[PDB]
Ligand binder design. Structure first.
Ligand SMILES: *[C@@H]1O[C@H](CO)[C@@H](O[C@@H]2O[C@H](CO)[C@@H](O[C@@H]3O[C@H](CO)[C@@H](O)[C@H](O[C@H]4O[C@H](CO)[C@@H](O)[C@H](O)[C@@H]4O)[C@@H]3O)[C@H](O)[C@H]2NC(C)=O)[C@H](O)[C@H]1NC(C)=O
Ligand code: CA
Ligand code: CA
Lengths: 859, 93
């Protein structure tokens, strides 16, 4: 890493000028005579005691236990930026009525409900009450700062200068800031894309956490510095409560965490360069409740196609098209499952996208057809920066229309990429997004096949020669807005445009899959993300879990990381350990570098080959479980890879655990994260709860810390007692033959002898489950000694050839007669096998279709 | 599918490893009764197994059991997709 190319709070002018304010009495106050209560909202005017500047506070109560408040100037020289396209729709409004009135304070009921808000005049302060219980306070310490619009003409209040770049400020300083205090809570998570632990540490002896999209080259761990993504969502957890803060602003953000209405045990402070104050408060009272509230606010995760859930193979140095054939034949020759092969920037004709160099790849469409003959997909890179050429018609078409980012003096921003130069289009313009989407047509994109997809990189955007590694802040975008206003929405706009283009190229039928690096709040509706370029170290293997956990805590369920690292090619043991780690993650892809070598599963040593193949088989067998988890995340917003305290919100020990995670509510995963460790300690929570390891089916009671020995072929995974998991036990080349393969059910009985599970089935590559309602949602329930199946959603009709082929029951005695009952048919007898030592029972060949409900009785 | 004359007519199909015994009705019922996978030679049910494709060309060899009914031709004669539906023609020359 090079910390010289990145700003601290001292180098950043607005952070320095805003953190100079010590906590104390606030000059801002509320005038209660100029208060207007309407059915839509509440409006009040605030004043500054010293400089006498009028501001407007607008407060709204939103249903499902939410509220939203905005602060903005009353007479501005020009309007400030309000972030569009992040919220899916206008949230519903809950009527506010004045409950009580006092000379200094006025209290309003939230709705026909228990919540209420108290607003005080001198000093201005907002308090949230759940009946008589305080939830959080606004402007408790008097840290509110609102730099008003100065005269259109002290260091740092005007045109600054970076190491070699001059950043002008034509409109002057417009910094905003606020503080919130949450009494009784000591655990706060969120603000993802920081190479840190799951639990955010206090930032009083160091720099604040930075939300700013940047391309950090060779980043390190355990730092509060910014990274590729930025999601301004904070979640504060308590054994009895759970609250959420959403800071809707697209500018550079610095957030401070402190510990201490003079005793709030956790304080948060937000500081932004520009914009208005737009804050969403989520009042819980549960973690699933705030998850659903944020899902209703900024949408849910888009349902991915089934092939994207498999193993992705990528390598920078895919020189010829025969190299792809060699990789495919190696995959199909050593019996290694694979779904998608990826291409880096080498495929483009000298960085010229939307085309193929004839010498590079002779016939791309024929190669795509050959790959589809083996039922596999190809993915190409498309960057949001293009070459400035007179023959490359993308530049000329974009220039004639005028869809570029303009520089300081009105010219065209032409920061040069390594071949020749490069231009940057203005993705904020909706017309530019429409043109970008229309450019993904089969007629437009040459050599285009339905089995070819696009992944976006360097969508921060990343300028090779500029301030930090990003664009200048004085660039003028569409609508007369500066780049400092719309920096954090560029990646979201690129991701949305690519997703719209890929879904429009098929007539709105097929499901697109767009994988992007930079993002913002609401990007989960357009695809997936990854944790940049990480080097191959054991420390990065340890830190791979908290980053994905933080990403999933804010709706980005489909997290992942590069397998084997990016720099510093790994040792075989570290490679095998990372393969085992990534076999239980939402995204699974191997990446390399030019200076590295060829690390492929077939090129590994023979002893490690079997372990890698077993890990791939375990990943491919759990495909129905992953698909059901992603469907649940798409329909509700609850993350797939969630921490331990989500399922157990009353166990304090789980409050600081990032070594192990939960895949839904059935599988507990604690992968090995050490070099040659003789064993691992796994914490099993639950008051009178059992867990069964996948390998030996040994039953362990909770809560405790089990020290289990491990080897090179050990992946510690436990199934929770009282769950049902579907699996595909036949390995196939890819994930398309398995679409019509039989299902095996694994039942982990609770101590009371009950279990429950769900399954979701579809064709996996279309939108038919929404338009014509063509999907299959099945629910399996084991009660007493009877296992029944039913329809979780009755309006889901789907015809599938899949039949249930085997039943596995864990923790049950041997039966004397196992029968099967169906609709309008005589009951038959099924042969079974029982193992007394491990107490497992196997029911052989039910031979019944999944779409038809049945019942299995055990005597 | 077996390339050997192990009859299921008179005796039930006992075993090849020697551990488990089954009747001949359970052979080729799309369920893997034996751990060796010998009870499903021409079926993809067995995780471990083979499928002796028959052809008149120059490539008599086994294929992995998961190559049966996968929609992709893997042998000379189109015998792996006999139940899949993907029609194939032999290139045995
Ligand atoms: C919007 O806010 C309202 C008001 O807070 C909220 O309604 C509340 O929901 C919670 C959670 O469902 C309720 O709390 C429950 O109350 C019952 C009755 O006292 C208790 O028995 C419950 O405890 C059970 O749960 C424990 C933990 O799971 C278990 O160990 C055990 O089984 C306990 O029996 C639980 O505390 C609360 O009563 C309501 N309040 C009202 C007024 O309805 C609503 O859900 C929120 N909605 C959204 C969408 O956020
Ligand atoms: Ca059989
Ligand atoms: Ca085949």
């Amino acid at each position: 890493v090079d910390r010289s190319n990145f700003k601290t709070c001292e180098e950043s002018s607005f952070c320095k000028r805003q953190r100079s304010i010590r906590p104390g009495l606030s000059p801002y106050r509320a005038l209660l005579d100029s208060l207007q209560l309407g059915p839509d909202s509440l409006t009040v005017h605030l004043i500054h005691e010293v400089t006498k500047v009028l501001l407007v506070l607008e407060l709204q109560g939103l249903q499902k236990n939410m509220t939203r408040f905005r602060i903005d100037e009353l007479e501005p020289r020009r309007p400030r930026y309000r972030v569009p396209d992040v919220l899916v729709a206008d949230p519903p409004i809950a009527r506010l009525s004045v409950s009580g009135r006092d000379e200094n304070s006025v209290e309003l009921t939230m709705a026909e409900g228990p919540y209420k808000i108290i607003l005080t005049a001198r000093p201005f302060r907002l308090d949230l009450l759940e009946d008589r219980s305080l939830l959080l306070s606004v402007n408790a310490r008097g840290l509110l700062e609102f730099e008003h619009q100065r005269a259109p003409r002290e260091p740092g209040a005007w045109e600054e200068t970076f190491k070699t770049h001059s950043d002008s400020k034509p409109y002057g300083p417009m910094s905003v800031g606020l503080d919130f205090s949450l009494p009784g809570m000591e655990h706060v998570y969120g603000i993802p894309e920081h190479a840190d632990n799951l639990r955010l540490k206090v930032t009083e002896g160091g720099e604040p956490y930075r939300l700013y999209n940047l391309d950090v080259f060779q980043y390190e761990l355990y730092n509060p510095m910014a990274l590729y993504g930025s999601v301004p969502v904070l979640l504060a957890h308590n054994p009895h409560r759970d609250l959420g803060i959403f800071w809707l602003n697209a500018a550079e953000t610095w957030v401070d965490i402190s510990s201490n209405g003079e005793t709030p045990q956790t304080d948060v402070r937000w500081m932004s360069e520009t914009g208005i104050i737009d804050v969403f408060l989520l009042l819980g009272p549960s973690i699933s409740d705030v998850f659903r509230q944020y899902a209703s606010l900024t949408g849910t995760q888009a349902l991915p196609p089934l092939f994207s859930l498999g193993y992705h193979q990528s390598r920078w140095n895919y020189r010829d098209e025969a190299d792809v054939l060699e990789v495919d034949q190696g995959f199909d020759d050593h019996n290694l499952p694979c779904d998608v092969i990826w291409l880096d920037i080498e495929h483009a004709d000298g960085k010229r996208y939307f085309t193929w160099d004839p010498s590079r790849f002779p016939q791309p469409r024929t190669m795509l057809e050959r790959l589809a003959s083996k039922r596999r997909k190809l993915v190409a890179i498309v960057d949001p920066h293009i070459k400035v050429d007179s023959g490359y018609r993308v530049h000329e078409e974009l220039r004639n229309l005028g869809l570029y980012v303009k520089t300081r003096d009105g010219s065209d921003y032409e920061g040069w990429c390594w071949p020749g130069s490069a231009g940057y289009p203005d993705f904020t313009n909706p017309t530019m997004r429409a043109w970008w989407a229309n450019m993904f047509s089969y007629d437009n994109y040459e050599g285009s096949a339905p089995n070819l997809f696009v992944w976006n990189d360097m969508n921060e955007p990343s300028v090779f020669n500029g301030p930090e590694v990003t664009m200048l802040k004085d660039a003028q975008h569409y609508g007369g807005w500066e780049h400092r206003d719309v920096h954090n929405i560029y990646g979201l706009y690129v991701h949305m445009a690519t997703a719209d283009g890929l879904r429009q190229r098929s007539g709105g039928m097929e499901r697109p899959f767009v994988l992007a690096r930079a993002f913002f709040a609401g990007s989960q509706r357009f695809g997936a993300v990854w944790t940049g370029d990480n080097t191959a170290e054991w420390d990065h293997l340890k830190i791979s879990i908290p980053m994905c956990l933080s990403l999933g805590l804010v709706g980005l369920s489909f997290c992942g990381a590069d397998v084997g690292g990016f720099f510093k090619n790994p040792e075989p043991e570290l490679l095998v350990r990372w393969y085992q780690m990534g076999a239980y993650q939402p995204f699974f892809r191997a990446h390399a570098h030019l200076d590295t070598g060829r690390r492929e599963p077939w090129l590994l040593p023979s002893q490690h080959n079997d372990i890698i193949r077993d890990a791939l088989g375990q990943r491919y067998s759990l495909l129905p479980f992953w698909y059901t988890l992603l469907y649940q995340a798409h329909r509700e917003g609850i993350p797939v890879m969630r921490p331990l305290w989500v399922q157990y919100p009353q166990d304090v020990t789980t409050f600081n655990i990032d070594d192990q995670y939960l895949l839904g509510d059935a599988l507990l995963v604690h992968p090995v994260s050490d070099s040659g460790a003789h064993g691992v300690q796994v914490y099993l929570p639950g008051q009178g709860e059992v867990w069964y390891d996948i390998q030996s089916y040994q039953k362990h009671h909770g809560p405790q810390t089990l020290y289990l020995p491990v080897t090179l072929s050990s992946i510690p995974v436990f199934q929770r007692g009282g769950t049902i998991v579907p699996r595909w036990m036949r390995v196939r080349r890819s994930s398309e033959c398995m679409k019509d393969d039989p299902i095996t059910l694994f039942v982990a009985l609770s101590p009371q002898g009950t279990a429950q599970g769900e399954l979701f089935l579809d064709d996996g590559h279309t939108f038919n489950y929404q338009t014509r309602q063509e999907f299959l949602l099945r629910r399996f329930s084991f009660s007493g000694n009877t296992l029944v199946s039913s329809s979780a959603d009755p309006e889901g009709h789907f015809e599938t050839p899949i039949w249930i082929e085997r039943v596995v029951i864990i923790g049950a005695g041997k039966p004397a007669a196992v029968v099967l009952q169906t609709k309008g048919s005589p009951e038959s007898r099924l042969s079974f096998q029982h193992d007394p030592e491990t107490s497992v029972l196997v029911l052989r060949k039910p031979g019944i279709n999944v779409a038809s409900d049945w019942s299995i009785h055990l005597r | 599918l077996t390339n050997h004359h192990f009859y299921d007519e008179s005796k039930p199909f006992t075993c090849l490893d020697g551990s488990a015994t089954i009747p001949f009705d359970q052979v080729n019922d799309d369920y893997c009764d034996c751990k060796d996978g010998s009870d499903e030679p021409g079926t993809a049910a067995c995780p471990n197994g083979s499928f002796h494709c028959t052809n008149t060309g120059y490539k008599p060899l086994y294929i992995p059991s998961n190559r049966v009914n996968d929609g992709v031709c893997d042998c000379c004669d189109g015998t792996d997709e006999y139940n899949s539906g993907v029609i194939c023609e032999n290139t045995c020359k």
